[PDB]
Design an enzyme around this catalytic site. Structure first.
Site, mmCIF file in Angstrom:
data_model
loop_
_atom_site.group_PDB
_atom_site.id
_atom_site.type_symbol
_atom_site.label_atom_id
_atom_site.label_comp_id
_atom_site.label_asym_id
_atom_site.label_seq_id
_atom_site.Cartn_x
_atom_site.Cartn_y
_atom_site.Cartn_z
ATOM 1 N N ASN A 165 41.579 23.147 44.567
ATOM 2 C CA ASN A 165 40.967 24.427 44.369
ATOM 3 C C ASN A 165 40.307 24.481 42.981
ATOM 4 O OD1 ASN A 165 41.104 27.215 45.849
ATOM 5 N ND2 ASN A 165 41.230 27.675 43.575
ATOM 6 N N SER A 167 38.692 27.575 40.514
ATOM 7 C CA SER A 167 38.619 29.025 40.409
ATOM 8 C C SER A 167 38.571 29.419 38.947
ATOM 9 C CB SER A 167 39.839 29.668 41.045
ATOM 10 O OG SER A 167 41.032 29.252 40.463
ATOM 11 N N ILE A 168 37.979 30.597 38.694
ATOM 12 C CA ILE A 168 38.070 31.244 37.370
ATOM 13 C C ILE A 168 39.321 32.129 37.347
ATOM 14 C CG2 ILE A 168 37.031 32.769 35.708
ATOM 15 C CD1 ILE A 168 34.310 32.065 36.902
ATOM 16 N N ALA A 169 40.114 31.937 36.296
ATOM 17 C CA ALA A 169 41.212 32.852 35.896
ATOM 18 C C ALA A 169 41.265 32.817 34.395
ATOM 19 C CB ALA A 169 42.578 32.460 36.433
ATOM 20 N N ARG A 170 41.477 33.953 33.713
ATOM 21 C CA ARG A 170 41.409 33.965 32.252
ATOM 22 C C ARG A 170 42.580 33.163 31.624
ATOM 23 N NH1 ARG A 170 43.576 40.254 32.085
ATOM 24 N NH2 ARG A 170 45.649 39.791 31.252
ATOM 25 N N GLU A 230 36.781 23.799 47.175
ATOM 26 C CA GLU A 230 35.483 24.296 46.722
ATOM 27 C C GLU A 230 34.481 23.223 46.553
ATOM 28 O OE1 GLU A 230 38.331 25.675 45.756
ATOM 29 O OE2 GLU A 230 38.023 27.936 45.968
ATOM 30 N N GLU A 279 39.210 44.151 30.151
ATOM 31 C CA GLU A 279 39.050 43.686 31.537
ATOM 32 C C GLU A 279 37.852 44.310 32.254
ATOM 33 O OE1 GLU A 279 42.990 44.923 33.296
ATOM 34 O OE2 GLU A 279 43.997 43.028 32.338
HETATM 35 C C1 LIG Z 1 33.714 35.694 37.417
HETATM 36 C C2 LIG Z 1 35.120 35.914 36.898
HETATM 37 C C3 LIG Z 1 36.183 35.934 37.795
HETATM 38 C C4 LIG Z 1 37.499 36.205 37.400
HETATM 39 C C5 LIG Z 1 37.689 36.499 36.015
HETATM 40 C C6 LIG Z 1 36.615 36.454 35.090
HETATM 41 C C7 LIG Z 1 35.302 36.183 35.532
HETATM 42 C C8 LIG Z 1 34.132 36.089 34.589
HETATM 43 C C9 LIG Z 1 37.058 36.742 33.637
HETATM 44 C C10 LIG Z 1 35.977 36.922 32.542
HETATM 45 C C11 LIG Z 1 37.879 35.503 33.217
HETATM 46 C C12 LIG Z 1 37.896 38.036 33.772
HETATM 47 C C13 LIG Z 1 39.111 38.051 34.693
HETATM 48 C C14 LIG Z 1 39.433 39.228 35.658
HETATM 49 C C15 LIG Z 1 40.555 38.695 36.560
HETATM 50 C C16 LIG Z 1 40.717 39.148 37.976
HETATM 51 C C17 LIG Z 1 41.942 38.895 38.595
HETATM 52 C C18 LIG Z 1 42.058 38.913 39.969
HETATM 53 C C19 LIG Z 1 40.987 39.303 40.762
HETATM 54 C C20 LIG Z 1 39.812 39.627 40.163
HETATM 55 C C21 LIG Z 1 39.670 39.500 38.781
HETATM 56 C C22 LIG Z 1 40.168 37.110 36.585
HETATM 57 C C23 LIG Z 1 41.400 36.368 36.074
HETATM 58 O O1 LIG Z 1 41.698 36.344 34.849
HETATM 59 N N1 LIG Z 1 42.268 35.855 37.007
HETATM 60 C C24 LIG Z 1 42.005 35.800 38.347
HETATM 61 O O2 LIG Z 1 42.941 35.565 39.122
HETATM 62 N N2 LIG Z 1 40.761 36.036 38.779
HETATM 63 C C25 LIG Z 1 39.865 36.455 37.966
HETATM 64 N N3 LIG Z 1 38.579 36.288 38.359
HETATM 65 C C26 LIG Z 1 38.324 36.246 39.856
HETATM 66 C C27 LIG Z 1 38.488 34.986 40.568
HETATM 67 O O3 LIG Z 1 37.612 33.996 40.102
HETATM 68 C C28 LIG Z 1 38.076 35.247 42.038
HETATM 69 O O4 LIG Z 1 39.054 36.042 42.612
HETATM 70 C C29 LIG Z 1 38.165 34.018 42.875
HETATM 71 O O5 LIG Z 1 38.058 34.361 44.255
HETATM 72 C C30 LIG Z 1 39.461 33.272 42.695
HETATM 73 O O6 LIG Z 1 39.300 31.945 43.299
HETATM 74 P P1 LIG Z 1 40.185 31.528 44.563
HETATM 75 O O7 LIG Z 1 39.586 32.306 45.765
HETATM 76 O O8 LIG Z 1 41.660 31.872 44.280
HETATM 77 O O9 LIG Z 1 40.003 30.058 44.744
HETATM 78 N N4 LIG Z 1 39.052 36.887 35.607
HETATM 79 K K LIG Z 2 37.126 30.070 44.492
HETATM 80 MN MN LIG Z 3 39.857 28.792 46.571
#
Ligand SMILES: Cc1cc2c3c(c1C)C(C)(C)C[C@H]1C[C@@H](c4ccccc4)[C@]4(C(=O)NC(=O)N=C4N2C[C@H](O)[C@H](O)[C@H](O)COP(=O)(O)O)N31
Ligand SMILES: [K+]
Ligand SMILES: [Mn+2]
Ligand SMILES: Cc1cc2c3c(c1C)C(C)(C)C[C@H]1C[C@@H](c4ccccc4)[C@]4(C(=O)NC(=O)N=C4N2C[C@H](O)[C@H](O)[C@H](O)COP(=O)(O)O)N31
Ligand SMILES: [K+]
Ligand SMILES: [K+]
Ligand SMILES: [K+]
Ligand SMILES: [Mn+2]
Lengths: 500, 500
Positions: A165, A167-170, A230, A279
């Protein structure tokens, strides 16, 4: 290398587009870079490239702010997103989302392993770097750490090897060789982490790649299905196999042109202080620190003159709106169609702080279903709010075919005038809630459960015999020949360009 | 005569302001005038003055469209409303609403009777006019009649003589000497009508004056209290006694400089077909004709070169938004304060199609009340939704002191992020509803009852210890000295005027 396949090329694209400002004088990563970026995002200005960042040493690092934010013009509003995907810069939101969904009924194109790439131009071992000495930004004045990770991609693999996988997570710096970050259900980084924790034998091999191929960071931000790697989805979307290099210290694979790569482990046992962070919904709650996941960094590799992308997130409009909201909406559209629901389009209005999704209904199909608002609302909300793609979304608004869901003014009009509060709505209290929304995690009820609603802005005859109004607007309340006469005489009479 | 006291002077004001377009070539009152006006209202253009209206004979009549609509510039957005009131054209919404409320704790200034005025320059008796032969506009292509009355003031008096009400209510031509129009509870024209019907002896003496003093048409659009004679309220507001002439055929009194006056009776027995009409919420339901009140016209008097004001109402933005919504909000603000509620400001967001009112709370005061959301929501909704001033409003949104209720973006932000759907809301089903909203009169429930809500966008600590966040925006998440540095270097760096 093409812009959608190489971050460095993407930066040039933005320059060529007259969508970049290069700042070559010293800029402080303590707030100043992020403040300039914040101002850009609140005014739809050009993306800033900080080439002289106070604290940059041995090539680590420059910063690009606002990589996926909006342009000022209406004609190329979404041009930065279009540049992530090889689309024309005038591409519509529909076209961007369709591109992001296109791989969902294609065969994956698995990645190609190559023996090296630019991301190996420089390396630092476990005795040569200190994350507290890099120019990591303090993004908001009350943040609980220096958030190095706002626009890179975490890479983790299931223990069995079958799912990798992206993904973006902070994440923020904890100390010289660790980060802390959010790892929360139902996200895939959390699902995989749980697999390793149940196995109980080792920490999770991990990499975090910054400045990855733009097409890859878009998929990293989209809730594509459980179990789907992905890289192969991006391959299918772009028609090309992505080129990946092996990490030095583990067996994961990172994009060959990644700007910066951290290699290490995500602990299955340890935690450390994380947050608070300014956030996506527009707030920070100072002092609200909680234990987060803990990452150990063992090695850094990087390109010469490496660039770190940064999201200075908060109030409208940044990557947390343009990418999180829109890409969840896209997935929700497909999910609804796969459940036999007559949805044509979905979008998360910016006005809603991306907490709503508007669903455009094919009302010809609806009529044939011979159903009612109560039943239909229940069906739609059960599909969406029980699925991961619905996690971030607390209000769904059903609208008929006359509404362009990509136009928030029209969504607000329809919501306000066609959905009777209470009666035309179904509340969902026994679904997963999104705690980051202030009214959830800092609100009057359970942070993790409920607070969701389906708001039906379909009018009664849209279920039975057909729309029974015309809008009281210029378009609908005047005949064609009259409208054209008005337009043709408009400047003649004395009243007052598409690109702008 | 000053612009706020004389419609003809008001027209000159708009010309002087570079806020008028005079069309001197023939324009058709069948749709064309209204289509041009509609386009003006959807684009915030200059007000149109149709000096050559096809069908004008013997001085009846020219049309001014969009008299209370918005200007394009932010600096003088509300300048047309400011010109109704002798205010600077840059006046804020707060200043306009405060001017409209100012007379509420002043002694009335009763009107002055004068023996003649411009409204007596021409007259037509009961053998000389035919309302079907005047250039009355067809405003929307599916309207059920030609709506002569969109911006004049009906004048009716209680049987006992003690209350003379001035108000806008629509009316259309029925035949050569009658109109039909809306007369519905709880409006004052309806309350007075009911008094005459209970007395049962005669039809209601009536006048309808078009092109009245602008200050008077503003009060005509505001729900000032039951029993309060608008003329004396306007007198107090403007600091001057309004000059009125007696009608020729009855004992009511009309503004001396009225452009056009109809004299006659409002029947206590008869009705006739009325509607449909393209209404404030943006819709028309073709064919939806219902029996309305029936007015007999006995005499017409008018100024030389008379001008009829017209609202081409519908989708954003026109008089039905700028005046109905804002003036109801103003009254609601005062009502709340008179009920000891800690409200500082109120506005009906345009985005809501003026169906919501946002109430700004003095949260210092709230904290001292030592109350809870449930209790406070109930209190606020009982005060507002049981009162006439709350009639048109279906959603109240409570916000704290950091929100500017006059800025719809900020109201939408707060609503979306601080009010948990369901839990943070109280529904009101046993209050009078506004049937003109589509989801009421053409919806799934009772047209006249319920469908109202109070949505609490106060966060929990705003009731207890104080706001506990900072916004993730440029203003709040960066120190002063840094913000000013950013702004001072903004154009130096390469990034991008108040009047615009
Ligand atoms: C574009 C983007 C996406 C983000 C985030 C950011 C940016 C710029 C920052 C700037 C870092 C801010 C925080 C905000 C924070 C947040 C937490 C949960 C949900 C939404 C946002 C969170 C985060 O910290 N953690 C998290 O769990 N997912 C995030 N997403 C969403 C995930 O990228 C999205 O959900 C994907 O689908 C994950 O992939 P997956 O499907 O599991 O393979 N961040
Ligand atoms: K993803
Ligand atoms: Mn995924
Ligand atoms: C500014 C303005 C106000 C209007 C209207 C219009 C415009 C331009 C048109 C273009 C004619 C469209 C329809 C829309 C329609 C409508 C109906 C009811 C409520 C709101 C609107 C109605 C109407 O036809 N009837 C009615 O009962 N009240 C209306 N008001 C509101 C009343 O002027 C307002 O309520 C006052 O407070 C009344 O005075 P009062 O307090 O009783 O002395 N019209
Ligand atoms: K509905
Ligand atoms: K009134
Ligand atoms: K709340
Ligand atoms: Mn009144």
């Amino acid at each position: 290398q093409p812009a959608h396949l190489c971050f460095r090329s993407f930066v040039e694209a933005l320059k060529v587009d007259n969508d970049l400002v290069e700042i070559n004088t010293p800029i402080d990563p303590n707030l100043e870079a992020a403040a300039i970026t914040r101002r850009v995002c609140e005014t739809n200005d050009k993306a800033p490239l900080f080439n002289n960042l106070i604290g940059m040493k041995n090539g680590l690092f420059r910063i690009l702010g606002a990589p996926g934010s909006l342009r000022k013009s209406s004609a190329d509003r979404y041009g930065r997103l279009a540049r992530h995907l090889a689309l024309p810069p005038t591409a519509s939101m529909r076209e961007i989302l369709d591109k992001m969904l296109s791989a969902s009924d294609m065969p994956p194109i698995p990645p190609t392993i190559v023996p090296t790439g630019p991301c190996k131009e420089n390396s630092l071992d476990d005795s040569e770097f200190d994350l507290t000495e890099l120019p990591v930004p303090l993004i908001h004045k009350s943040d609980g750490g220096k958030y190095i990770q706002t626009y890179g991609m975490h890479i983790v693999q299931s223990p069995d090897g079958t799912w990798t996988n992206w993904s973006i997570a902070r994440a923020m710096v904890h100390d010289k060789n660790h980060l802390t970050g959010l790892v929360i259900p139902p996200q895939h980084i959390w699902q995989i982490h749980q697999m390793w924790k149940k196995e109980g034998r080792s920490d999770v091999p991990w990499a975090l790649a910054f400045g990855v191929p733009p097409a890859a960071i878009m998929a990293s931000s989209m809730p594509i299905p459980d179990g789907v790697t992905e890289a192969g989805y991006v391959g299918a979307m772009t028609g090309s196999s992505l080129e990946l290099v092996k990490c030095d210290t583990n067996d994961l694979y990172v994009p060959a042109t990644s700007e910066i790569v951290l290699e290490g482990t995500l602990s299955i046992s340890e935690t450390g202080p994380e947050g608070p962070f300014g956030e996506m919904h527009g707030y920070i709650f100072p002092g609200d620190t909680h234990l987060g996941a803990k990452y150990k960094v063992n090695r850094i590799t990087y390109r010469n003159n490496a660039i770190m992308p940064m999201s200075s997130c908060g109030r409208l409009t940044d990557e947390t709106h343009t990418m999180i909201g829109s890409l969840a909406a896209a997935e929700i559209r497909k999910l609804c169609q796969q459940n036999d629901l007559p949805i044509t389009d979905a979008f998360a209005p910016f006005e809603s702080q991306v907490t709503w999704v508007a669903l455009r209904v094919d009302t010809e199909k609806l009529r044939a279903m011979k159903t009612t608002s109560e039943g239909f609302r229940k069906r739609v909300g059960d599909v969406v709010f029980n699925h991961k793609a619905g996690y971030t979304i607390h209000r769904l608004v059903l609208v008929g075919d006359d509404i362009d869901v990509y136009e928030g003014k029209d969504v607000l009009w329809a919501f306000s005038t066609r959905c009777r509060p209470g009666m035309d709505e179904t509340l969902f209290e026994d679904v997963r809630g999104f705690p980051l929304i202030p009214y959830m995690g800092h609100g009057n009820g359970p942070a993790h459960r409920g607070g969701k609603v389906v708001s039906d802005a379909l009018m009664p005859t849209e279920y039975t015999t057909g729309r029974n109004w015309e809008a009281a607007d210029f378009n609908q309340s005047y005949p064609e020949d009259l409208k054209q006469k008005v337009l043709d005489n408009w400047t003649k009479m004395g009243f007052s360009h598409h690109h702008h």
